[PDB]
Nucleic acid binder design. Sequence first.
DNA 1: TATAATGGGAGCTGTCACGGATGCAGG
DNA 2: CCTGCATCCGTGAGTCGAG
Lengths: 111, 157
Amino acid sequence: PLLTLEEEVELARKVEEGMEAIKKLSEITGLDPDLIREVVRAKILGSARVRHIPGLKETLDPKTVEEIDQKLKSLPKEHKRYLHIAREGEAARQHLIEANLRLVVSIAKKY
Amino acid sequence: RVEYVKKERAGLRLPLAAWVEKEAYKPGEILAELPEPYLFRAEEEGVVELKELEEGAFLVLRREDEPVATYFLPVGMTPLVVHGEIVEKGQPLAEAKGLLRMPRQVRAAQVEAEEEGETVYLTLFLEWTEPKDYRVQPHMNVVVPEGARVEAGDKIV
DNA sequence: TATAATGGGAGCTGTCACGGATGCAGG
DNA sequence: CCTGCATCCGTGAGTCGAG
């Protein structure tokens, strides 16, 4: 279904704050922002999708995503907040992309 | 809707026999029974600030700025004065008829009673909540859950 | 890199006869 | 539920030459 303005704003906000939270977790743990982002995304999407990313410096297997997830979860509470923020950020991103797909159709019909 | 907790101290004078004697008063609980209309007179001179609630009200009398008096008007007592009005000692502030009781919004925690003549002047410690609505535009978001207690300075939306 | 925009469009129409599978009403 | 008949789908449909 199509988003109401409040939902659009909400999802966008969650996404932006999610990215900010990823930068934050990068400042905290000391890992690669891309790595953390792809781990969060891996956990959000599911176990179905884990695949090596051309950008990353390491192979991303579920073993490694679990190592990194365990190093993220073991952080202090106030730091652990940003993990949840990033997660709901990714979920909001998925929902936001899936929501606007009709626009792509109506644009591509002219081409 | 933010319900703001307020606790103040306000006096009420009543006929001695009509008063039902109790240590504290639950909201809605009978404060007294009157055989006949009793006007509640002003014990201090000054300007009147009438603060009205859903039911029952507050009369704050003051000279200059600083309040010289605070009176509480429970349910069943109809105020005889308007806001911003000059009153003198002895003129009726309100009129109580029949049975009067506490408002459902406010509760009296403790009651200090004083015997004077045929009357009693009750010093009430009152606790109530004053609501304030806040309109939220689609571009904002609520950072607080249902029934969550907030203090001063805390961000809601 | 920023008004807002949120489900497509053409279709091809006059053959004929077969094997095999697939399905439905009937014994 | 097993058999039989109706229906759908895919597969074929001469040779060489010239254009």
